[PDB]
Design an enzyme around this catalytic site. Structure first.
Site, short mmCIF file in Angstrom:
data_model
loop_
_atom_site.label_atom_id
_atom_site.label_comp_id
_atom_site.label_asym_id
_atom_site.label_seq_id
_atom_site.Cartn_x
_atom_site.Cartn_y
_atom_site.Cartn_z
N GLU A 161 0.97 -1.19 -0.07
CA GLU A 161 -0.01 0.04 0.10
C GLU A 161 0.97 1.21 0.15
O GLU A 161 0.58 2.13 0.99
CB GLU A 161 -0.99 0.10 1.19
CG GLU A 161 -1.80 -1.14 1.18
CD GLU A 161 -3.24 -0.99 1.82
OE1 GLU A 161 -3.32 -0.10 2.75
OE2 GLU A 161 -4.05 -1.89 1.71
N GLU A 278 -5.32 -8.77 -0.77
CA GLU A 278 -5.94 -8.74 0.22
C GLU A 278 -7.58 -8.48 0.30
O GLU A 278 -7.81 -7.39 -1.00
CB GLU A 278 -5.28 -7.27 0.97
CG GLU A 278 -4.24 -7.74 2.13
CD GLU A 278 -3.77 -6.38 2.87
OE1 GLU A 278 -4.60 -5.77 3.61
OE2 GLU A 278 -2.40 -6.19 2.94
O1 LIG Z 1 -2.20 -4.67 6.87
C1 LIG Z 1 -3.40 -4.42 6.27
C2 LIG Z 1 -3.43 -3.16 5.42
O2 LIG Z 1 -2.64 -3.35 4.48
C3 LIG Z 1 -4.78 -2.68 5.09
O3 LIG Z 1 -4.88 -1.45 4.97
O4 LIG Z 1 -5.81 -3.07 6.09
C4 LIG Z 1 -5.85 -4.38 6.55
C5 LIG Z 1 -4.46 -4.20 7.38
O5 LIG Z 1 -4.39 -5.29 8.06
#
Ligand SMILES: O[C@@H]1[C@@H](O)[C@H](O)OC[C@H]1O
Ligand code: NA
Ligand code: NA
Lengths: 502, 502
Positions: A161, A278
């Site tokens: 990120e 993610e």
């Molecule tokens: O590390 C993760 C992050 O990258 C995201 O913003 O949200 C989940 C967090 O746990």
């Protein structure tokens, strides 16, 4: 109310195995914990995940990069004791790392800005050519330990990120490109077959994807996949113990998926593989939404449709083994994990296991159901019903006509909702114990499982009819299969002769 | 050289089981590690250790002390998530904690001074009354979860080596006495049957034992046992990778045992049990003396004799899982443990297990051999031969006349020296590989076992004679047993009819 008639012989799509390509994790260092391995082993017995994606391979708890002083010299030392034990245990379990290069080891850092409770460092290297030597030694080891046929199956994503200032100093896009370029060129020089990619951003800065892709094309820095994170949480309310978040409808995420496939098709790399490294509703490790049957029903559509767009989408995370917001202070604390401590499956876990039952051949599908046909030509289906509000329509009725060309059918149904497979509710009734007894744990295990019911019926006119009503926040699985009755082979069989009114 | 005639039916002392009362460990937070639980299980399959002693129960990786801010008021939070999992696993394995209160959690600390790589704060609490509530709540929690009957078998040792400035600000003796009073009075208020104790000093400051026992008698401060550490390392040489040390003769440490017993014999508590809560030769985690056959031979005398003086003495440590000097950087690296990584037992390990064969009635004991009688009247003995220098004298010969009232005798010998049971030698031969492969590891495990040989003698004149010679740094164990020959029951038994020249 939702009436569905399946025609004999018609398909409409392929359901792919993308949904189980990769799953998320607490920091790599936390893989040393027995609870982690116990958890990962338990998950792997139920969902054949191929890869595991976690922060912090280079954090100093894993202890890779250190410095020795000889004379006045400062010479690096690369320590593999821990990462060896970790990757070994991944491979024995049957899962490979989705390597995430990060974050900055303290003795290479340029500043002191850190992220999270474990204080991972997010500044660029003071000397970029000593960061090049770390990456190359780290990759060279691996090839020596694990061999190239193995390590080239491992993808390497670069950082996390960077479009946020909390993960990357000043969210400096130019400096993130220099970092991506130094790092992937270190990797490729050791073995060019290792696939790499980026830029690992969260939503709300999608221009980074165009900028990053142009940067790789104008210069000749390689990119073999795209990565991006997708959440659906509106801005959050904080608390000493909780983070509470509202969420967009799940369609907001599926829309985000496809506009990202759009960008890549208008990119200099029109066939680039996309990995959503993610995803989840809420994006905080202390948000109770992750514990509920809502999050099972709400995320279910992603597993139905997500593979239409991206090559992988990795649920954050497989276990509550997590330390980003300090050590959890209650068994149910809003952690990301599919699995709460002591291997107590959350509703979301069971929802995931239902997709083990989908065949490749899609018979039908809308916003709230998926129907498939397996290779043995039995039929299976998964329906969900996420309910965001007290005032919403609470039930969701289905009437489904299914053709079958045999005469005796066996129906199996698995249900999780607010009543069944909802250990969080029992936890509440128990008094919300922060640190429960063994006996309390075992009782939560007894309830933490789907309601399973079985029916037998004769088939009339070449079809059967499934009528069922999902309650609030339910997910259910149905499996329709043929009975080859053997009762004729039992000589003298007569249940009526058994005491018990049979 | 050394001729021994065991006279029939005569005994001297009694060999007690203090040697296996307690064993040491890396910090409690490291007990979360799979490798740690794997090693402990391995040890406890071979040595029935009753107690386990480790630093850092209150360290911030275990996470117990935390603060919440409701209002501007800060209130305390006690997080038992990790410590519950840890002590649960100790109890499941079958070992109990020798609880060590310490060190100081960051938010209670009065200053910035820390010990070890993991930075345990060693300053007193800024507010002694908020330190008291911590102790009460931790012990009350232990009692709530595990039960009065169980926790009152857990002894509580207060702090660690407060005579050293590195472990306690300014090595202030009065400040420590106040800490000890406040802590144990908190302990006792929760349950007065919990054994407390101290002062856990390092060697070389033994007037502290007189000062601390007098302090308690004078002011009615409970103390149920004494603790102290015993090492033998001379001042060390340092290296980017090693610490090297010479050692006093082992007699030096046995002298300290009998000395500290004398002090409590001359104290207001003449019957105080004494627990030697750490012991070893070198006291540094990166000193290769710990990996060698020498340390096994060198430490054997204390197991044989230490229990004459102290109630327990716990080898620091059961396993190389350890972080005081950062993550170890090679399979053999000088670590304290009986067991190296991947459960590879060191010579010292095998030496310990030998003592499982000692019965309670001692037939004969000197500086280098212990001979005992087990309950079935079989005889067992452990002989050792630590050779400190290349000069010295390297071999020790033995001639032992043991009387037996049965005619046919079976002898089993187990030997470890530089040739046998010395994985360190093989590792050197292999190249000293820092991060060995599975095949290398497996080969090391193959050689890390005692040499086992068996004998049959028909007895002449009511006694057998054991004749053997110990090489340099050897430890060996013999077991002598009666044979009821059953060969007469095999009808037609003739080995001379088996091809092979039998
Ligand atoms: O590390 C993760 C992050 O990258 C995201 O913003 O949200 C989940 C967090 O746990
Ligand atoms: Na519907
Ligand atoms: Na984490």
């Amino acid at each position: 109310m939702n009436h569905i008639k399946i025609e004999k012989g018609k398909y409409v799509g392929v359901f792919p195995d993308n949904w189980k390509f990769c799953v998320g994790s607490g920091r790599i260092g936390l893989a040393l914990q027995k609870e982690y391995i116990d958890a990962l082993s338990f998950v792997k017995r139920h969902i054949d995940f191929k890869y595991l994606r976690a922060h912090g391979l280079l954090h100093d708890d894993v202890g890779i990069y250190r410095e020795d002083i000889v004379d006045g010299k400062t010479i690096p030392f690369y320590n593999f004791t821990y990462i060896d034990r970790i990757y070994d245990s991944f491979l024995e379990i049957g899962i490979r790392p989705f390597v995430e290069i990060g974050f900055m080891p303290s003795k290479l850092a340029s500043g002191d800005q850190t992220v999270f409770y474990w204080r991972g460092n997010v500044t660029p290297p003071k000397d970029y050519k000593e960061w090049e030597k770390l990456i190359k030694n780290v990759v060279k080891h691996f090839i020596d330990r694990y061999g190239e046929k193995e390590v080239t199956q491992w993808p390497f994503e670069i950082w996390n990120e960077p479009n946020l200032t909390v993960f990357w100093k000043d969210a400096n896009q130019a400096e993130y490109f220099k970092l991506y370029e130094v790092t992937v060129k270190a990797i490729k020089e050791v073995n060019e077959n290792i696939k790499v990619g980026g830029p690992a951003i969260c939503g709300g800065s999608d221009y980074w994807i165009t900028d990053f892709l142009n940067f790789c094309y104008k210069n000749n820095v390689p990119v073999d996949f795209l990565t991006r994170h997708a959440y659906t949480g509106k801005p959050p309310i904080y608390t000493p113990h909780f983070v509470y978040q509202d969420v967009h409808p799940i369609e907001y995420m599926l829309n985000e998926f496809k506009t990202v496939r759009e960008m890549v098709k208008n990119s200099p790399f029109p066939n680039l593989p996309i990995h959503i490294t993610e995803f989840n509703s809420s994006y905080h490790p202390l948000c109770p939404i992750h514990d509920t049957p809502f999050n099972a029903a709400y995320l279910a559509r992603v597993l139905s449709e997500g593979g239409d767009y991206v090559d992988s989408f990795s649920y954050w995370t497989f276990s509550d083994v997590f330390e980003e917001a300090d050590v959890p202070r209650s068994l149910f604390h809003g952690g990301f994990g599919l699995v709460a401590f002591h291997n107590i499956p959350k509703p979301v876990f069971h929802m995931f296991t239902f997709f083990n039952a989908m065949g490749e051949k899609i018979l039908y599908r809308d916003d709230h159901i998926l129907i498939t046909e397996r290779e043995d030509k039995s039929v299976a289906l998964i329906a969900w019903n996420e309910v965001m509000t007290k005032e919403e329509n609470q039930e969701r009725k289905y009437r489904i006509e299914i053709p079958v060309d045999y005469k005796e059918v066996f129906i199996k149904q698995k249900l999780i909702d607010e009543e069944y497979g909802n250990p969080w509710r029992t936890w509440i009734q128990m008094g919300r114990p922060r640190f429960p007894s063994k006996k309390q744990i075992e009782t939560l295990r007894e309830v933490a499982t789907p309601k399973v019911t079985t029916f037998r019926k004769t088939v009339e006119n070449g079809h059967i009819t499934l009528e069922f009503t999902l309650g609030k926040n339910a997910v259910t699985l149905f499996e329709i299969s043929k009975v080859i009755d053997e009762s004729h082979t039992y000589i003298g069989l007569d249940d009526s002769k058994i005491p018990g009114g049979y």
